[PDB]
Amino acid sequence: PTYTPKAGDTTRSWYVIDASDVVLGRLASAAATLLRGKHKPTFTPNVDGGDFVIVINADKIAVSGDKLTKKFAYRHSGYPGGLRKRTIGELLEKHPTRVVENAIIGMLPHNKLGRQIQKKLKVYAGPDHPHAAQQPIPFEIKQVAQ
Amino acid sequence: ARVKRALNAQKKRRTVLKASKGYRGQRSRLYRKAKEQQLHSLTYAYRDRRARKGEFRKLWISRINAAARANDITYNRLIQGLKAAGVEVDRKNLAELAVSDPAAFTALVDVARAALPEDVNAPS
Amino acid sequence: TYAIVKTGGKQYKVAAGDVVKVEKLDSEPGASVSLPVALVVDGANVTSKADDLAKVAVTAEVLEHTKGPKIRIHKFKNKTGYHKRQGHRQQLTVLKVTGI
Amino acid sequence: EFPSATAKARYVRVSATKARRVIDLVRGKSVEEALDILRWAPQAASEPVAKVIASAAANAQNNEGLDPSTLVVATVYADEGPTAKRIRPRAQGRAFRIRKRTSHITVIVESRPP
Amino acid sequence: VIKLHDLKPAPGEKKAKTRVGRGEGSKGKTAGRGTKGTKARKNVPVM
RNA sequence: GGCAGCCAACGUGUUGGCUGGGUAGGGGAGCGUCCUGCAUCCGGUGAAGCCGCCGAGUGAUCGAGUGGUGGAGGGUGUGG
RNA sequence: AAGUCCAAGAGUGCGGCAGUGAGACGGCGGGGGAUAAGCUCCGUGCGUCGAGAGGGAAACAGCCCAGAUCGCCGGCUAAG
RNA sequence: GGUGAAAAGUACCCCGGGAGGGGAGUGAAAGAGUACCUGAAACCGUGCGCUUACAAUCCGUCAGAGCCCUCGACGUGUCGUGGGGUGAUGGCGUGCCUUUUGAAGAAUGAGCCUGCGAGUCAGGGACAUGUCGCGAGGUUAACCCGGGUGGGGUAGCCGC
Numbered sequence: 001p002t003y004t005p006k007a008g009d010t011t012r013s014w015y016v017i018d019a020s021d022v023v024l025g026r027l028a029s030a031a032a033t034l035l036r037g038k039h040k041p042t043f044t045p046n047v048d049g050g051d052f053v054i055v056i057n058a059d060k061i062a063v064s065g066d067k068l069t070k071k072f073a074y075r076h077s078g079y080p081g082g083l084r085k086r087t088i089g090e091l092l093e094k095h096p097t098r099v100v101e102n103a104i105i106g107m108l109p110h111n112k113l114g115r116q117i118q119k120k121l122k123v124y125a126g127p128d129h130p131h132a133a134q135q136p137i138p139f140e141i142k143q144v145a146q
Numbered sequence: 147a148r149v150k151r152a153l154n155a156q157k158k159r160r161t162v163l164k165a166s167k168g169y170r171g172q173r174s175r176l177y178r179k180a181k182e183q184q185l186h187s188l189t190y191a192y193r194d195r196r197a198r199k200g201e202f203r204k205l206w207i208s209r210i211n212a213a214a215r216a217n218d219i220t221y222n223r224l225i226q227g228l229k230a231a232g233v234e235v236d237r238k239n240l241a242e243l244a245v246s247d248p249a250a251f252t253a254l255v256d257v258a259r260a261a262l263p264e265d266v267n268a269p270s
Numbered sequence: 271t272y273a274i275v276k277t278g279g280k281q282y283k284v285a286a287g288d289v290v291k292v293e294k295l296d297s298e299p300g301a302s303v304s305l306p307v308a309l310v311v312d313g314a315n316v317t318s319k320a321d322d323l324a325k326v327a328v329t330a331e332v333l334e335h336t337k338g339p340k341i342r343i344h345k346f347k348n349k350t351g352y353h354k355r356q357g358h359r360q361q362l363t364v365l366k367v368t369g370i
Numbered sequence: 371e372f373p374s375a376t377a378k379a380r381y382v383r384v385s386a387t388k389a390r391r392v393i394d395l396v397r398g399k400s401v402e403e404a405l406d407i408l409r410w411a412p413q414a415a416s417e418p419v420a421k422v423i424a425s426a427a428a429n430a431q432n433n434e435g436l437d438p439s440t441l442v443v444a445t446v447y448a449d450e451g452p453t454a455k456r457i458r459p460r461a462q463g464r465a466f467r468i469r470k471r472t473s474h475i476t477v478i479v480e481s482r483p484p
Numbered sequence: 485v486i487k488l489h490d491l492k493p494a495p496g497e498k499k500a501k502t503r504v505g506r507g508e509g510s511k512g513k514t515a516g517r518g519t520k521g522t523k524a525r526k527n528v529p530v531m
Numbered sequence: 532g533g534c535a536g537c538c539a540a541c542g543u544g545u546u547g548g549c550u551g552g553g554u555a556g557g558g559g560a561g562c563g564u565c566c567u568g569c570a571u572c573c574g575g576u577g578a579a580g581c582c583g584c585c586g587a588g589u590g591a592u593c594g595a596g597u598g599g600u601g602g603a604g605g606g607u608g609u610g611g
Numbered sequence: 612a613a614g615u616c617c618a619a620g621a622g623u624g625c626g627g628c629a630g631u632g633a634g635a636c637g638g639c640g641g642g643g644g645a646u647a648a649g650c651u652c653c654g655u656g657c658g659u660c661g662a663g664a665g666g667g668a669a670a671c672a673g674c675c676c677a678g679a680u681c682g683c684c685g686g687c688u689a690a691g
Numbered sequence: 692g693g694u695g696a697a698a699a700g701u702a703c704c705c706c707g708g709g710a711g712g713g714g715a716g717u718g719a720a721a722g723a724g725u726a727c728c729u730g731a732a733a734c735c736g737u738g739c740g741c742u743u744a745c746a747a748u749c750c751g752u753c754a755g756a757g758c759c760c761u762c763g764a765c766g767u768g769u770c771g772u773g774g775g776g777u778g779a780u781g782g783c784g785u786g787c788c789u790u791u792u793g794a795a796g797a798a799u800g801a802g803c804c805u806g807c808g809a810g811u812c813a814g815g816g817a818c819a820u821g822u823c824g825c826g827a828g829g830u831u832a833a834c835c836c837g838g839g840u841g842g843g844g845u846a847g848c849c850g851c
């Protein structure tokens with residue numbers, strides 16, 4: 001029989017990532033991989049196996065192209081004709097954290113286990129964080145060469 | 147000779163419901179609603195009995211890729227190097243080792259990189 | 271002390287004193303059989319070279335022959351009237367490994 | 371196990387769920403609180419249920435010689451019984467049926483020391 | 485030593501009578517007439 | 532690893548080569564129920580029906596396999 | 612003239628049995644249509660669905676890869 | 692249509708106005724009390740174990756932690772060629788029959804259960820297919836005599 005995680009065999013860890021001048025797509029993909037926990041060999045899809053990840057400086061996200069004005073973030077409130085339109089520039093001007101939150105929630109699984117993984121992502125705008133008590137390990141995204 | 151129908155229908159209907167025990171609503175209490183989704187349930191069993199090998203292999207490869215990236219190597223490179231070295235161990239045993247002995251993976255990745263050629267983009 | 275053993279075209283991770291469920295092989299129960307080696311792990315070191323794999327052998331004792339749980343096969347196709355039934359039950363054997 | 375006594379009244383001319391409404395208010399209580407609640411609950415079903423509880427208390431006190439102050443209601447439940455069948459004329463001369471329902475009542479009393 | 489017990493028919497002398505329209509396992513829903521038609525209802529004259 | 536059909540060799544059924552998705556439809560082999568024949572047998576020391584547990588058959592299933600209700604009839608076999 | 616020649620279960624005749632004579636899609640050659648239809652009518656030792664299980668194109672019979680005897684918590688692959 | 696072996700059909704006491712019930716007794720049994728053998732399923736609950744109130748679902752299957760019960764070896768719970776009931780959570784997942792080229796179809800039918808309900812039947816009728824006896828012969832009907840299916844019956848029949 002293959003291995004599956006037990007009740008308390010699951011382990012967590014705290015990682016902090018700076019987002020200054022980092023590409024949104026790469027940063028968010030790496031974060032999603034970390035929250036799902038594909039970095040541990042004890043991965044199992046029916047139970048959460050990832051780590052808590054904290055991102056700093058959500059307002060310093062850098063994106064390529066002219067999408068600062070030509071990319072839109074959409075949502076509809078519920079009434080007919082209630083569709084409203086905002087850009088990434090306005091989104092970072094108003095709530096900088098929303099863009100990173102949306103990007104990460106878009107690639108996590110869209111099931112209840114996925115939104116349960118979403119429960120454990122901390123996203124802030126400023127350079128400080130009140131979670132220094134949990135001594136997070138700084139994480140820098142790297143690529144394996146082959 | 148008239149053969150009035152007491153046990154013949156009863157035996158088969160009871161075996162249908164008994165096999166259909168454990169459902170909700172009319173499902174586990176009612177015959178005409180049992181046989182239909184009884185057959186649906188067993189058809190699902192037939193299909194996912196094949197699907198189970200695929201899903202397990204998927205999870206298996208996922209765990210192996212995780213272990214390889216922890217040991218700083220990609221899944222495709224690890225598998226190609228393993229085939230070049232001529233080791234016939236299968237993903238079941240690799241996954242159990244990844245759960246079990248990182249020393250075993252350390253030795254295995256060392257063997258794989260040793261068997262890896264000089265240049266990966268050679269025309270050979 | 272655990273090892274990987276080849277049997278019936280299958281591979282298994284078995285340790286000393288363990289009992290494993292493998293496919294049926296023609297052998298009288300209570301006898302001993304010899305099997306090839308795919309991997310052996312002994313504490314800190316491991317042996318993976320094919321030469322050592324062929325050199326090392328694993329001996330196990332056939333304990334009993336058993337039939338698995340009943341599995342029933344139903345091929346049913348909607349709106350066409352095709353309705354098929356079939357049961358199945360495989361013979362399986364249990365081996366207790368002795369020495370590796 | 372603890373000593374217990376049972377008493378029931380069948381063929382009572384009330385609806386099953388309509389008596390169960392009152393019956394849900396007496397489960398697990400002591401006999402004194404039960405009598406008080408049945409006296410003070412304005413329902414038609416309160417009368418047969420209170421009569422059954424009183425009869426069960428009388429049986430427990432007489433046949434087994436138990437002290438009423440320590441009796442409590444162990445389990446009480448109502449089950450539907452045979453239903454009287456009638457016909458009612460309705461509009462356009464077309465006819466519908468009336469199901470005259472009847473219910474069973476069961477009360478068992480347990481004596482629990484304080 | 486033959487009793488009334490030891491009486492058997494010839495092999496193949498007994499052929500099973502076919503029960504038509506007696507379950508979709510063997511013959512179902514059509515009774516060997518196929519789909520709709522006058523042959524499915526009664527008959528056709530020989531001439 | 533196992534069942535099944537066709538075929539070849541030899542035998543008083545093993546080996547070997549292939550095939551096995553299928554509606555209408557054709558062919559072959561079976562399960563179960565009621566009622567009769569007989570050789571016989573079970574059953575108030577509990578039959579049938581009723582409600583479970585454990586097993587076994589490739590299937591309709593089977594268990595002279597047992598537990599709680601029931602108090603009066605049934606079964607193997609080969610046949611029809 | 613060769614090749615499967617332990618069989619494609621190939622051909623032809625006769626005998627017993629019923630189904631069908633409402634097709635659809637796609638690729639080819641075409642008519643009508645406006646080179647319009649998911650249109651109609653043909654031809655196809657064309658293919659597929661009908662009468663087909665699985666993977667891929669998000670879903671999607673007909674397109675692409677590929678033929679489900681049963682089982683395995685085994686490996687190599689086609690389309691992608 | 693069925694209490695029972697027979698009415699031996701529940702004296703008496705108690706709750707209740709009665710209906711209804713509990714004991715005590717009858718009886719082998721009252722889980723046989725006249726609404727009476729056996730009493731299933733649809734049906735309506737009670738009590739117990741588990742799950743569920745951030746949750747988008749032809750409701751199941753494949754994995755699958757936890758909780759509860761059980762069986763052996765080993766101590767306070769831990770494994771073992773373990774079962775049981777529940778199942779949080781992930782993969783897949785568009786009921787059945789018809790008639791259709793084409794249906795989950797927003798095409799038809801089914802509220803549910805218990806029974807009832809469909810290739811049957813007669814002829815020296817005819818053909819072909821297995822089986823049985825005789826053989827250049829194969830054979831009978833009606834009918835007569837045996838509480839009995841047996842014996843007789845050459846009128847005809849089919850190929851030579």
Ligand SMILES: [Mg+2]
Nearest residue numbers: 168169170778
């Ligand atoms: Mg369930």
Ligand SMILES: [Mg+2]
Nearest residue numbers: 348349350794
């Ligand atoms: Mg269809």
Ligand SMILES: [Mg+2]
Nearest residue numbers: 351508512513
């Ligand atoms: Mg059919």
Ligand SMILES: [Mg+2]
Nearest residue numbers: 411412413416
């Ligand atoms: Mg009142």
Ligand SMILES: [Mg+2]
Nearest residue numbers: 519520521633
């Ligand atoms: Mg037609």
Ligand SMILES: [Mg+2]
Nearest residue numbers: 513519520789
């Ligand atoms: Mg029809």
Ligand SMILES: [Mg+2]
Nearest residue numbers: 518519520521
């Ligand atoms: Mg027809």
Ligand SMILES: [Mg+2]
Nearest residue numbers: 538546547548
């Ligand atoms: Mg053979």
Ligand SMILES: [Mg+2]
Nearest residue numbers: 354551552553
């Ligand atoms: Mg077939």
Ligand SMILES: [Mg+2]
Nearest residue numbers: 510511555556
């Ligand atoms: Mg057919």
Ligand SMILES: [Mg+2]
Nearest residue numbers: 575576577602
């Ligand atoms: Mg007796």
Ligand SMILES: [Mg+2]
Nearest residue numbers: 575576577599
């Ligand atoms: Mg007894």
Ligand SMILES: [Mg+2]
Nearest residue numbers: 577578597598
């Ligand atoms: Mg018995």
Ligand SMILES: [Mg+2]
Nearest residue numbers: 577601602603
């Ligand atoms: Mg009895």
Ligand SMILES: [Mg+2]
Nearest residue numbers: 579604605606
């Ligand atoms: Mg009988």
Ligand SMILES: [Mg+2]
Nearest residue numbers: 563564606607
């Ligand atoms: Mg029998």
